[PDB]
Each structure stands twice: as structure tokens, then as C-alpha cells.
Amino acid sequence: DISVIQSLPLSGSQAVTGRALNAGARLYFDWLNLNGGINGETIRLVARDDEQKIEQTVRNVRDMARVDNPVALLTVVGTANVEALMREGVLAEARLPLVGPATGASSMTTDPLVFPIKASYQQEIDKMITALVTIGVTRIGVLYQEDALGKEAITGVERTLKAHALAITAMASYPRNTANVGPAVDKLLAADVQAIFLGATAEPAAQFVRQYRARGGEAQLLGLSSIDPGILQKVAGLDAVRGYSLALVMPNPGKSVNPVIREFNRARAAVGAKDVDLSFRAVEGFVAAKVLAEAIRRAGPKPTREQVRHALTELRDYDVGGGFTVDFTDRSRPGSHYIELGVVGPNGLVIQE
Ligand SMILES: CC(C)C[C@H](N)C(=O)O
Ligand SMILES: [Mg+2]
Ligand SMILES: [Mn+2]
Ligand code: NI
Ligand code: NI
């Protein structure tokens, strides 16, 4: 078989996110296999829980790269986790391409073996923050994770605001791999802010939103694509989440007619993956897997790690469906140039524009 590996959080604070990315990728490959696989070959996806622990991501990838004979690695979660794989030379040692890292950090476009797909965090921040400034907002607060993710958020928001002669009004942090946002909620509730940007992961974002609103917080809420709006409204409650602003960097699960969403639903039914729920992060995994599959297909029979890498670097506007194209020929930017703003409607529907 042709093997592909994944190291992500299947337990712990980030379990919801890791499970979704794995579910989407597994769904796509099971679907591909039901349809004949790739050039008559079966694709095997091997996953391993890293609990989003940086050192465990490193160990997992190195171990799997040696034992599972993979041609590529898919959707690793955590800016700090991926940066460790790059910094410690794990990918270089295995000559293993990382397709679709589940983070839009700016560093994702600085490694020959890393192939970011979705529009970056900076693109998200520029679009969302500029929209706020354009409508008159001048007082912005920021919730940030106390690690590389938070640094990306603060630096990014500060950069965009500086372009408009503005600066962050208040900021508060929380520990990575936890949802301990109590102190942050206290601080931002006291701040005289009109909007609060969430540079956080799913669980802490949800806890912050629920608590902030429950205690009288009225600021407009918005955040990075690291926060699935579907999960957010489920955990924090629609009463606190309706109105939440976001940047769409993947096909919207809410648009059932979108070709990628239609394929996801057809795949789910055909495979009989009752345990898999349609969500933004699951779609991200599905999309990453499909992009990798196309590269494997182009690599030819019994493809090697080198051939797959080569194929990836030559994908020029490959359409995953509905116009969501990926171009890896320019390594200085994300494969996808797609990005639009969206909002969570009164009843929870994610609407574009
Ligand atoms: C930037 C990362 C730390 C965020 C993480 N990859 C997530 O999707 O939750
Ligand atoms: Mg992300
Ligand atoms: Mn189809
Ligand atoms: Ni070539
Ligand atoms: Ni386009």
C-alpha cells in the first residue's frame, strides 16, 4: 500500500480539533479506496495521538517516518508543534513533505518540506481587523495563547492596526494545551473594548466566549480559523456566539451545494462513516488529503517520498472542487489564495460576506 501519516491531538484540550482533521482525512482516503484507490493502489492512513505536546509530535513523526514507510505527513496541529518539526529537522531527516499543516502561521511558508494550503493567519487578521477599523472600531482587545500561536496573533494584529495609526487596547493570555481562561476573562471584561480578537484554539476560545458573555461582556467577537465556529457555538452556546465574525479559508460546510461539501457528504454516506460529522476542520482534513492524493497520483506507480514531493511542488491550480484551487509552484505563499469573511447568524448558520 501507499502510506500517509498524521500526528495530531486525539486526546486532551485539542482532541476535538485533532479528531476532526483525522476524521476528514480518513474519510477522504476511505472514499478514494472505495473508488479504486490511486493507480490501483490502496492508501493507508496511519495516525498517532500527540496530545498536542510539542516533543510528542516530534517523536511521533520520526517514529512513523521510519516504521510506516509514508510518502507524506498530513495536517499537524499547533504552530509550536510544526515549528518544532521544522526547527529540529525531523522533516528534513525523513525527507517527508508535510501537506496542509493545520496552522496558518507565517512560518509555514519558510520550509521546503512544508506545504501550507489555507490562507494564512496574517491574511485573516488583515481582512478582519481592517473591516473593523473601516466601520469605526478603535478599541480592540486580544485573547492570545501563551506560545507561538499567541505571538502570531499579537504581532499580526499590531501590524495591521499600526497601518491605521492604532494599537491594541488590551491583551490577555492563557496557557497552551489548556482552557484556563479565567484570568483572561477578568482582564478583558474590565477593558473598555469594542471588539475582542481570539488568537486561540477551540476549547479556550469557547470557554472565554461563554464566560465573557455570561458576565456581561458586549464586545464584538472574532477569531482565527483555528476556531471552528461549529464547535464554538456548540460548546459556548449560541446565545454567546451569534454574531461571531470569522475569515473563511475553506469551503463552507453551511453551503451544502458547494462541490467539496457535496463530495464530503457523498463520501460520508458511501463509506458509512456515521461517526464523522461535517465541520470546518473535518473539511480541512478532507481537502488536505485530496490535495495529497492528487500529488500521489501524479507521482506514478509505487511512488517514492521524493516523487511525491516533486509532484507537490508542481501542482499549479489543482481544483479540489468548486474553484478551490491549490498552487504550490510559488513556495513563498499558501497553496490556496481563497479567503472571505463570514459571520455566525442568529440561529448558528455561517454566512459568507
Ligand atoms: C496555530 C495553531 C496553534 C492552532 C492549531 N493548529 C489549531 O488548529 O487549533
Ligand atoms: Mg489553524
Ligand atoms: Mn463525487
Ligand atoms: Ni517535474
Ligand atoms: Ni480562486
Side-chain angles (χ1 to χ4, degrees), residues 181-272:
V181 299
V185 175
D186 297 328
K187 189 173 184 182
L188 293 176
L189 272 172
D192 185 37
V193 295
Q194 297 158 312
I196 292 173
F197 184 93
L198 311 177
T201 52
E203 186 171 57
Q207 288 295 166
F208 177 88
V209 174
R210 177 183 282 291
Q211 292 169 45
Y212 178 71
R213 281 277 190 264
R215 295 171 62 183
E218 294 302 330
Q220 165 66 52
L221 302 168
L222 59 160
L224 294 173
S225 62
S226 50
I227 302 165
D228 189 314
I231 303 176
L232 182 61
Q233 67 185 83
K234 166 62 64 178
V235 181
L238 190 56
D239 287 345
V241 180
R242 57 172 59 94
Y244 175 77
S245 290
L246 61 139
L248 300 164
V249 298
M250 280 287 134
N252 181 7
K255 295 189 186 61
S256 64
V257 300
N258 171 278
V260 177
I261 302 307
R262 279 193 283 101
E263 191 186 0
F264 185 106
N265 285 327
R266 289 309 92 218
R268 179 176 178 292
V271 171

Coordinates of all heavy atoms in Angstrom, one line a residue, residues 181-272:
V181 N -8.9 30.1 31.0 CA -9.0 31.5 30.6 C -9.6 32.4 31.6 O -9.8 33.6 31.3 CB -9.9 31.5 29.3 CG1 -9.2 30.7 28.2 CG2 -11.3 30.9 29.6
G182 N -9.9 31.9 32.8 CA -10.5 32.7 33.8 C -9.8 34.1 34.0 O -10.5 35.1 33.9
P183 N -8.5 34.2 34.2 CA -7.8 35.4 34.4 C -7.9 36.3 33.2 O -8.0 37.6 33.3 CB -6.4 35.0 34.6 CG -6.5 33.7 35.3 CD -7.6 33.0 34.5
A184 N -8.0 35.7 32.0 CA -8.1 36.5 30.7 C -9.5 37.1 30.7 O -9.6 38.2 30.2 CB -7.9 35.6 29.5
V185 N -10.5 36.4 31.1 CA -11.9 36.9 31.1 C -12.0 38.1 32.0 O -12.6 39.1 31.7 CB -12.9 35.8 31.5 CG1 -14.3 36.4 31.6 CG2 -12.9 34.6 30.5
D186 N -11.4 38.0 33.2 CA -11.4 39.0 34.2 C -10.8 40.3 33.6 O -11.4 41.4 33.6 CB -10.6 38.7 35.4 CG -11.2 37.5 36.2 OD1 -12.5 37.3 36.1 OD2 -10.4 36.8 36.9
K187 N -9.6 40.2 33.0 CA -8.9 41.3 32.4 C -9.6 42.0 31.2 O -9.7 43.2 31.1 CB -7.5 40.9 31.9 CG -6.6 42.0 31.5 CD -5.2 41.5 31.2 CE -4.3 42.7 30.9 NZ -2.9 42.3 30.6
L188 N -10.2 41.2 30.3 CA -10.8 41.7 29.1 C -12.2 42.3 29.4 O -12.7 43.2 28.7 CB -10.9 40.7 28.0 CG -9.5 40.4 27.4 CD1 -9.6 39.3 26.3 CD2 -8.9 41.7 26.8
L189 N -12.9 41.8 30.5 CA -14.2 42.3 30.9 C -14.0 43.7 31.4 O -14.8 44.6 31.1 CB -14.8 41.4 32.0 CG -15.6 40.2 31.6 CD1 -15.9 39.4 32.9 CD2 -16.9 40.6 31.0
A190 N -12.9 43.9 32.1 CA -12.5 45.3 32.6 C -12.1 46.2 31.6 O -12.1 47.5 31.8 CB -11.5 45.1 33.7
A191 N -11.6 45.7 30.5 CA -11.1 46.6 29.4 C -12.2 47.2 28.6 O -13.3 46.6 28.4 CB -10.2 45.8 28.4
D192 N -12.1 48.5 28.3 CA -13.1 49.2 27.5 C -12.9 49.0 26.0 O -12.6 49.9 25.3 CB -13.0 50.7 27.9 CG -14.1 51.5 27.2 OD1 -15.2 51.0 27.2 OD2 -13.8 52.7 26.8
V193 N -13.2 47.7 25.6 CA -13.0 47.4 24.2 C -14.3 47.2 23.4 O -15.3 46.8 24.0 CB -12.2 46.1 24.1 CG1 -10.8 46.3 24.6 CG2 -12.8 45.0 24.9
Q194 N -14.2 47.5 22.1 CA -15.4 47.4 21.3 C -15.4 46.0 20.6 O -16.4 45.6 20.1 CB -15.4 48.5 20.2 CG -15.5 49.9 20.8 CD -15.0 50.9 19.9 OE1 -13.9 50.8 19.3 NE2 -15.7 52.0 19.7
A195 N -14.2 45.4 20.5 CA -14.1 44.1 19.8 C -12.9 43.4 20.5 O -12.0 44.0 21.0 CB -13.8 44.3 18.3
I196 N -13.1 42.0 20.5 CA -12.0 41.2 21.1 C -11.7 40.1 20.0 O -12.6 39.4 19.6 CB -12.5 40.5 22.4 CG1 -12.6 41.6 23.5 CG2 -11.4 39.5 22.8 CD1 -13.2 41.0 24.7
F197 N -10.4 40.0 19.7 CA -9.9 39.1 18.7 C -9.4 37.9 19.4 O -8.6 38.0 20.4 CB -8.8 39.7 17.8 CG -8.3 38.8 16.7 CD1 -8.9 38.9 15.5 CD2 -7.3 37.9 17.0 CE1 -8.4 38.1 14.5 CE2 -6.8 37.1 16.0 CZ -7.4 37.1 14.7
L198 N -9.8 36.7 19.0 CA -9.3 35.4 19.7 C -8.2 34.7 18.9 O -8.5 34.0 17.9 CB -10.5 34.5 19.8 CG -11.8 35.1 20.5 CD1 -12.9 34.0 20.5 CD2 -11.5 35.6 21.9
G199 N -7.0 34.9 19.4 CA -5.9 34.2 18.9 C -5.7 33.0 19.7 O -4.7 32.9 20.5
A200 N -6.6 32.1 19.6 CA -6.6 30.9 20.5 C -7.1 29.6 19.8 O -7.5 29.7 18.6 CB -7.5 31.1 21.7
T201 N -7.1 28.5 20.5 CA -7.6 27.3 20.0 C -9.0 27.1 20.4 O -9.6 27.9 21.2 CB -6.7 26.1 20.5 OG1 -6.7 26.2 22.0 CG2 -5.3 26.2 19.9
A202 N -9.7 26.1 19.9 CA -11.1 25.8 20.1 C -11.6 25.8 21.5 O -12.5 26.6 21.8 CB -11.5 24.5 19.4
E203 N -11.1 25.0 22.4 CA -11.6 24.9 23.8 C -11.4 26.2 24.6 O -12.4 26.7 25.2 CB -10.9 23.8 24.5 CG -11.5 23.6 25.9 CD -11.0 22.3 26.6 OE1 -9.8 22.1 26.7 OE2 -11.9 21.5 27.0
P204 N -10.2 26.8 24.6 CA -10.1 28.1 25.4 C -11.0 29.2 24.8 O -11.6 30.0 25.5 CB -8.6 28.4 25.3 CG -8.1 27.7 24.1 CD -8.9 26.4 24.2
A205 N -11.1 29.2 23.4 CA -11.9 30.2 22.8 C -13.4 30.1 23.2 O -14.0 31.0 23.6 CB -11.8 30.0 21.3
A206 N -13.9 28.8 23.2 CA -15.3 28.5 23.7 C -15.5 28.9 25.1 O -16.5 29.6 25.4 CB -15.6 27.1 23.4
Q207 N -14.6 28.6 26.0 CA -14.7 28.9 27.4 C -14.7 30.4 27.6 O -15.4 31.0 28.4 CB -13.6 28.2 28.2 CG -13.9 26.7 28.3 CD -15.1 26.4 29.1 OE1 -15.6 25.2 29.1 NE2 -15.7 27.4 29.8
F208 N -13.8 31.1 26.9 CA -13.7 32.5 27.0 C -15.0 33.2 26.6 O -15.5 34.0 27.3 CB -12.5 33.1 26.2 CG -12.4 34.6 26.2 CD1 -11.7 35.2 27.2 CD2 -13.2 35.4 25.3 CE1 -11.7 36.6 27.3 CE2 -13.1 36.7 25.4 CZ -12.4 37.4 26.4
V209 N -15.5 32.8 25.4 CA -16.7 33.4 24.9 C -17.9 33.2 25.8 O -18.6 34.1 26.1 CB -17.0 32.8 23.5 CG1 -18.4 33.3 23.0 CG2 -16.0 33.3 22.5
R210 N -18.1 31.9 26.3 CA -19.2 31.6 27.2 C -19.2 32.5 28.4 O -20.1 33.1 28.8 CB -19.2 30.2 27.5 CG -20.4 29.8 28.5 CD -20.3 28.3 29.0 NE -20.9 27.4 28.0 CZ -22.2 27.4 27.6 NH1 -23.1 28.2 28.2 NH2 -22.6 26.5 26.7
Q211 N -18.0 32.5 29.1 CA -17.8 33.2 30.3 C -17.9 34.7 30.1 O -18.5 35.5 30.9 CB -16.5 32.8 31.0 CG -16.4 31.4 31.5 CD -15.0 30.9 31.9 OE1 -14.3 31.7 32.5 NE2 -14.7 29.7 31.5
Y212 N -17.2 35.2 29.1 CA -17.2 36.7 28.8 C -18.6 37.2 28.6 O -19.0 38.2 29.3 CB -16.4 37.0 27.6 CG -16.3 38.4 27.1 CD1 -15.6 39.4 27.9 CD2 -17.0 38.9 26.0 CE1 -15.6 40.7 27.5 CE2 -17.0 40.2 25.6 CZ -16.3 41.1 26.4 OH -16.3 42.4 26.1
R213 N -19.4 36.5 27.8 CA -20.8 36.9 27.6 C -21.7 36.7 28.8 O -22.5 37.6 29.1 CB -21.4 36.2 26.4 CG -20.9 36.7 25.0 CD -21.8 37.9 24.6 NE -21.5 38.2 23.2 CZ -20.7 39.1 22.7 NH1 -20.0 39.9 23.6 NH2 -20.5 39.3 21.4
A214 N -21.5 35.6 29.5 CA -22.3 35.4 30.7 C -22.1 36.4 31.8 O -23.0 36.7 32.5 CB -21.9 34.0 31.2
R215 N -20.9 37.0 31.8 CA -20.6 38.0 32.8 C -20.9 39.5 32.3 O -20.4 40.4 33.0 CB -19.2 37.9 33.3 CG -19.0 36.5 34.0 CD -17.5 36.3 34.3 NE -16.9 37.3 35.2 CZ -15.6 37.3 35.5 NH1 -14.8 36.4 35.1 NH2 -15.2 38.3 36.3
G216 N -21.6 39.6 31.2 CA -21.9 41.0 30.7 C -21.0 41.6 29.6 O -21.2 42.7 29.3
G217 N -20.1 40.8 29.1 CA -19.2 41.3 28.1 C -20.0 41.6 26.8 O -20.7 40.7 26.3
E218 N -19.8 42.7 26.2 CA -20.6 43.1 25.0 C -19.8 43.3 23.7 O -20.3 43.6 22.7 CB -21.4 44.4 25.2 CG -22.5 44.2 26.3 CD -23.5 43.1 25.9 OE1 -23.7 42.9 24.7 OE2 -24.1 42.5 26.8
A219 N -18.4 43.1 23.8 CA -17.6 43.4 22.6 C -17.9 42.4 21.5 O -18.4 41.3 21.7 CB -16.1 43.2 23.0
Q220 N -17.7 42.9 20.3 CA -17.9 42.1 19.0 C -16.8 41.1 19.1 O -15.7 41.4 19.4 CB -17.7 43.0 17.8 CG -17.6 42.2 16.5 CD -18.8 41.4 16.1 OE1 -19.9 42.0 16.1 NE2 -18.6 40.1 15.8
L221 N -17.1 39.8 18.8 CA -16.1 38.8 18.9 C -15.7 38.3 17.5 O -16.5 38.2 16.6 CB -16.6 37.6 19.7 CG -17.0 38.0 21.2 CD1 -17.8 36.8 21.8 CD2 -15.8 38.3 22.0
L222 N -14.4 38.0 17.3 CA -13.9 37.5 16.1 C -12.7 36.7 16.4 O -12.1 36.8 17.5 CB -13.6 38.6 15.1 CG -12.6 39.7 15.5 CD1 -12.0 40.4 14.3 CD2 -13.2 40.7 16.5
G223 N -12.2 35.8 15.5 CA -11.1 35.0 15.8 C -10.5 34.2 14.6 O -11.1 34.2 13.5
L224 N -9.4 33.6 14.8 CA -8.7 32.8 13.7 C -9.4 31.5 13.3 O -10.2 31.0 14.1 CB -7.3 32.5 14.2 CG -6.3 33.7 14.4 CD1 -5.0 33.2 15.0 CD2 -6.1 34.4 13.0
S225 N -9.1 31.0 12.2 CA -9.6 29.8 11.6 C -9.3 28.6 12.5 O -9.7 27.4 12.2 CB -9.2 29.6 10.2 OG -7.8 29.4 10.1
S226 N -8.5 28.8 13.5 CA -8.1 27.7 14.4 C -9.3 27.4 15.3 O -9.3 26.4 16.1 CB -6.9 28.2 15.3 OG -7.2 29.4 15.9
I227 N -10.3 28.3 15.2 CA -11.5 28.2 16.0 C -12.7 27.8 15.1 O -13.3 28.7 14.4 CB -11.9 29.5 16.7 CG1 -10.7 29.8 17.6 CG2 -13.2 29.3 17.5 CD1 -10.7 31.3 18.1
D228 N -13.1 26.5 15.1 CA -14.2 26.1 14.3 C -15.5 26.7 14.8 O -15.9 26.5 16.0 CB -14.3 24.6 14.3 CG -15.3 24.0 13.3 OD1 -16.4 24.5 13.2 OD2 -15.0 23.0 12.7
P229 N -16.2 27.6 14.0 CA -17.4 28.2 14.5 C -18.5 27.2 14.9 O -19.4 27.5 15.7 CB -17.9 29.1 13.4 CG -17.3 28.4 12.2 CD -16.0 27.9 12.6
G230 N -18.5 26.0 14.3 CA -19.5 25.0 14.6 C -19.3 24.5 16.0 O -20.2 24.4 16.8
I231 N -18.0 24.2 16.4 CA -17.6 23.7 17.7 C -17.9 24.9 18.7 O -18.3 24.6 19.8 CB -16.2 23.3 17.7 CG1 -15.9 22.3 16.7 CG2 -15.8 22.8 19.1 CD1 -14.4 21.8 16.6
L232 N -17.5 26.1 18.3 CA -17.6 27.2 19.2 C -19.1 27.4 19.7 O -19.3 27.6 20.9 CB -17.1 28.5 18.5 CG -17.2 29.8 19.3 CD1 -16.2 29.7 20.5 CD2 -16.7 31.0 18.4
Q233 N -20.0 27.4 18.8 CA -21.4 27.6 19.2 C -21.9 26.5 20.0 O -22.8 26.7 20.9 CB -22.3 27.9 18.0 CG -22.5 26.8 17.0 CD -23.3 27.2 15.8 OE1 -22.7 27.8 14.8 NE2 -24.6 26.9 15.8
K234 N -21.4 25.3 19.8 CA -21.9 24.1 20.5 C -21.4 24.1 21.9 O -22.2 23.9 22.9 CB -21.3 22.8 19.8 CG -21.4 21.6 20.7 CD -22.9 21.2 21.0 CE -23.7 20.9 19.8 NZ -25.1 20.5 20.1
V235 N -20.2 24.4 22.2 CA -19.6 24.5 23.5 C -19.9 25.8 24.3 O -20.3 25.7 25.4 CB -18.1 24.3 23.4 CG1 -17.5 24.3 24.8 CG2 -17.7 23.0 22.8
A236 N -19.8 26.9 23.6 CA -20.1 28.2 24.3 C -21.5 28.6 24.3 O -22.0 29.4 25.2 CB -19.3 29.3 23.6
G237 N -22.3 28.0 23.4 CA -23.7 28.3 23.4 C -24.0 29.4 22.4 O -23.3 30.4 22.3
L238 N -25.1 29.2 21.6 CA -25.4 30.2 20.5 C -25.7 31.6 21.1 O -25.4 32.6 20.5 CB -26.7 29.7 19.8 CG -27.0 30.5 18.5 CD1 -25.9 30.5 17.6 CD2 -28.2 29.8 17.8
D239 N -26.3 31.6 22.3 CA -26.6 32.9 22.9 C -25.3 33.8 23.0 O -25.4 35.0 22.9 CB -27.2 32.8 24.3 CG -28.6 32.3 24.3 OD1 -29.2 32.3 23.2 OD2 -29.1 31.9 25.4
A240 N -24.2 33.2 23.3 CA -22.9 33.9 23.4 C -22.2 34.0 22.1 O -21.4 35.0 21.9 CB -22.0 33.2 24.4
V241 N -22.4 33.1 21.2 CA -21.8 33.0 19.9 C -22.4 33.7 18.7 O -21.7 34.1 17.8 CB -21.4 31.6 19.5 CG1 -20.7 31.5 18.2 CG2 -20.5 31.0 20.6
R242 N -23.7 33.9 18.6 CA -24.3 34.5 17.5 C -23.7 35.9 17.2 O -23.5 36.6 18.2 CB -25.9 34.6 17.6 CG -26.4 35.4 18.9 CD -27.9 35.6 18.8 NE -28.6 34.4 18.7 CZ -29.2 33.7 19.7 NH1 -29.0 34.2 20.9 NH2 -29.8 32.6 19.5
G243 N -23.3 36.1 16.0 CA -22.7 37.4 15.6 C -21.2 37.3 15.5 O -20.6 38.2 14.9
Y244 N -20.6 36.2 16.0 CA -19.2 36.0 15.9 C -18.7 36.1 14.4 O -19.3 35.6 13.5 CB -18.9 34.6 16.4 CG -17.4 34.1 16.3 CD1 -16.4 34.6 17.1 CD2 -17.0 33.3 15.3 CE1 -15.1 34.2 17.0 CE2 -15.7 32.8 15.1 CZ -14.7 33.3 16.0 OH -13.4 32.9 15.9
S245 N -17.6 36.9 14.3 CA -17.0 37.1 12.9 C -15.8 36.2 12.7 O -15.0 35.9 13.6 CB -16.6 38.6 12.8 OG -17.7 39.4 12.7
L246 N -15.6 35.8 11.4 CA -14.5 34.9 11.1 C -14.1 35.1 9.7 O -14.7 35.9 8.9 CB -14.9 33.5 11.3 CG -16.1 33.0 10.4 CD1 -15.8 31.6 9.9 CD2 -17.3 33.0 11.3
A247 N -13.0 34.5 9.3 CA -12.5 34.5 8.0 C -12.5 33.1 7.4 O -12.0 32.2 8.0 CB -11.0 35.0 7.9
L248 N -13.2 32.9 6.3 CA -13.4 31.6 5.7 C -12.2 31.3 4.8 O -11.8 32.1 3.9 CB -14.6 31.6 4.8 CG -16.0 31.9 5.5 CD1 -17.0 32.2 4.4 CD2 -16.4 30.7 6.3
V249 N -11.5 30.2 5.1 CA -10.3 29.9 4.3 C -10.5 28.5 3.7 O -9.6 27.9 3.1 CB -9.0 29.9 5.2 CG1 -8.8 31.3 5.6 CG2 -9.1 29.0 6.3
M250 N -11.6 27.9 3.9 CA -12.0 26.6 3.4 C -13.4 26.6 3.0 O -14.2 27.5 3.3 CB -11.9 25.5 4.6 CG -10.5 25.0 4.9 SD -9.9 23.8 3.6 CE -8.1 24.6 3.4
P251 N -13.8 25.6 2.1 CA -15.2 25.6 1.7 C -16.1 25.6 2.9 O -15.9 24.9 3.9 CB -15.3 24.3 0.9 CG -13.9 24.2 0.3 CD -13.0 24.6 1.5
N252 N -17.2 26.4 2.9 CA -18.1 26.5 4.0 C -19.1 25.3 4.1 O -19.9 25.1 3.2 CB -18.9 27.8 3.8 CG -19.9 28.1 5.0 OD1 -19.9 27.3 6.0 ND2 -20.7 29.1 4.8
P253 N -19.0 24.6 5.2 CA -19.9 23.4 5.4 C -21.4 23.8 5.3 O -22.3 23.0 5.0 CB -19.6 23.0 6.8 CG -18.1 23.3 6.9 CD -18.0 24.7 6.3
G254 N -21.7 25.1 5.6 CA -23.0 25.6 5.6 C -23.6 25.7 4.2 O -24.8 25.7 4.0
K255 N -22.7 25.8 3.2 CA -23.1 25.9 1.8 C -23.2 24.5 1.2 O -22.2 24.0 0.6 CB -22.2 26.7 0.9 CG -22.1 28.2 1.3 CD -21.2 28.9 0.3 CE -21.0 30.4 0.7 NZ -20.3 30.4 2.0
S256 N -24.3 23.8 1.5 CA -24.4 22.4 1.0 C -24.2 22.1 -0.5 O -23.8 21.0 -0.9 CB -25.8 21.8 1.4 OG -26.8 22.5 0.8
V257 N -24.5 23.2 -1.3 CA -24.3 23.0 -2.7 C -22.8 23.1 -3.2 O -22.5 22.8 -4.4 CB -25.2 24.0 -3.6 CG1 -26.6 23.8 -3.2 CG2 -24.7 25.4 -3.3
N258 N -21.9 23.6 -2.3 CA -20.5 23.7 -2.7 C -20.1 22.3 -3.1 O -20.3 21.3 -2.4 CB -19.7 24.2 -1.6 CG -18.2 24.2 -1.9 OD1 -17.6 23.1 -1.7 ND2 -17.7 25.3 -2.3
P259 N -19.4 22.1 -4.3 CA -18.9 20.8 -4.7 C -18.0 20.0 -3.7 O -18.2 18.8 -3.6 CB -18.0 21.2 -6.0 CG -18.8 22.4 -6.5 CD -19.1 23.2 -5.3
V260 N -17.2 20.7 -2.9 CA -16.4 20.0 -2.0 C -17.3 19.4 -0.8 O -17.1 18.3 -0.4 CB -15.3 20.9 -1.3 CG1 -14.5 20.1 -0.3 CG2 -14.3 21.3 -2.4
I261 N -18.2 20.3 -0.4 CA -19.2 19.9 0.7 C -20.0 18.7 0.1 O -20.3 17.8 0.9 CB -20.0 21.0 1.1 CG1 -19.1 22.2 1.6 CG2 -21.0 20.6 2.2 CD1 -18.1 21.8 2.7
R262 N -20.4 18.8 -1.1 CA -21.2 17.7 -1.7 C -20.4 16.4 -1.7 O -21.0 15.4 -1.4 CB -21.8 18.1 -3.1 CG -23.0 19.0 -3.0 CD -23.7 19.1 -4.3 NE -23.1 20.0 -5.3 CZ -22.4 19.6 -6.3 NH1 -22.2 18.3 -6.5 NH2 -21.8 20.5 -7.1
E263 N -19.2 16.5 -2.1 CA -18.4 15.3 -2.2 C -18.2 14.7 -0.8 O -18.2 13.5 -0.6 CB -17.0 15.6 -2.8 CG -16.3 14.2 -3.1 CD -14.8 14.4 -3.6 OE1 -14.4 15.6 -3.8 OE2 -14.2 13.4 -3.9
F264 N -18.0 15.6 0.2 CA -17.8 15.2 1.6 C -19.0 14.4 2.1 O -18.9 13.3 2.6 CB -17.6 16.4 2.5 CG -17.3 16.1 3.9 CD1 -16.0 16.2 4.4 CD2 -18.2 15.6 4.8 CE1 -15.7 15.9 5.8 CE2 -17.9 15.3 6.1 CZ -16.7 15.5 6.6
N265 N -20.2 14.9 1.8 CA -21.4 14.3 2.2 C -21.7 13.0 1.4 O -22.2 12.0 2.0 CB -22.7 15.2 2.0 CG -22.7 16.2 3.1 OD1 -22.3 16.0 4.2 ND2 -23.2 17.4 2.8
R266 N -21.3 12.9 0.2 CA -21.5 11.7 -0.6 C -20.5 10.7 -0.1 O -20.8 9.5 0.0 CB -21.2 12.0 -2.1 CG -22.3 12.8 -2.8 CD -23.7 12.2 -2.6 NE -24.3 12.8 -1.5 CZ -25.1 12.1 -0.6 NH1 -25.3 10.8 -0.8 NH2 -25.7 12.8 0.4
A267 N -19.3 11.1 0.2 CA -18.2 10.2 0.8 C -18.7 9.6 2.1 O -18.6 8.4 2.3 CB -16.9 10.9 0.9
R268 N -19.2 10.5 3.0 CA -19.7 10.0 4.3 C -20.7 8.9 4.2 O -20.6 7.9 4.8 CB -20.2 11.2 5.1 CG -20.8 10.8 6.5 CD -21.2 12.1 7.2 NE -21.8 11.7 8.5 CZ -22.9 11.1 8.7 NH1 -23.7 10.7 7.7 NH2 -23.4 10.9 9.9
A269 N -21.7 9.1 3.3 CA -22.7 8.1 3.1 C -22.2 6.8 2.4 O -22.5 5.7 2.9 CB -23.8 8.7 2.2
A270 N -21.4 7.0 1.4 CA -20.8 5.8 0.7 C -19.9 4.9 1.6 O -20.0 3.7 1.6 CB -20.0 6.2 -0.5
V271 N -19.1 5.6 2.4 CA -18.2 4.9 3.3 C -18.9 4.4 4.6 O -18.5 3.3 5.1 CB -17.0 5.8 3.8 CG1 -16.2 5.2 4.9 CG2 -16.1 6.1 2.6
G272 N -20.0 5.0 4.9 CA -20.8 4.6 6.1 C -20.1 5.1 7.4 O -20.2 4.5 8.4

